[PDB]
């Protein structure tokens, strides 16, 4: 959860030089990103998730 005492940081990506293309090729491309954990990840204090909710017992 959010807490200023344990702020994380900021991840920013910047153009280094440019994106140059030859003739008859598109000049607008896309980039995709995947996130994963390293060999040293750990978690603790199991709690309920704030995403799933039910108004009544589904039936």
């Amino acid at each position: 959860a959010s807490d200023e005492y344990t702020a994380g940081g900021f991840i920013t990506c910047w153009y280094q030089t440019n994106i140059v293309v030859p003739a008859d090729a598109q000049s607008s491309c896309y980039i995709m990103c995947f996130v994963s954990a390293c060999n040293d990840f750990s978690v603790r204090l199991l709690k309920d998730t704030p995403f799933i909710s039910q108004n009544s017992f589904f039936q």
């Binding site: 959860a1 959010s2 702020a7 994380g8 940081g9 900021f10 991840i11 920013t12 990506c13 910047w14 153009y15 280094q16 030089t17 440019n18 994106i19 140059v20 293309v21 000049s27 607008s28 491309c29 896309y30 980039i31 995709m32 990103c33 995947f34 996130v35 994963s36 954990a37 390293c38 040293d40 990840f41 750990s42 978690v43 603790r44 204090l45 199991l46 709690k47 309920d48 998730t49 704030p50 995403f51």
Partner: protein, 59 residues
């Protein structure tokens, strides 16, 4: 953009300048809207604490 396949794409085009920004987000895996629905985020939202490194793979 969250209601289509355009949410996972980061646009990059041939610019007339250099040094501009492409994207940026805070390191909040269990809170920020960017990492909330990732597998890592879905797992983290069940546990109060977390520690370790992170690996961002760009394609």
């Amino acid at each position: 953009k969250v209601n289509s396949m355009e949410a996972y794409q980061i646009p990059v085009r041939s610019n007339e300048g250099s040094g501009t920004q492409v994207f940026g987000f805070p390191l909040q895996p269990g809170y920020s809207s960017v990492f909330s629905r990732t597998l890592l985020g879905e797992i983290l939202n069940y546990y109060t604490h977390w520690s370790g490194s992170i690996k961002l793979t760009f394609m």
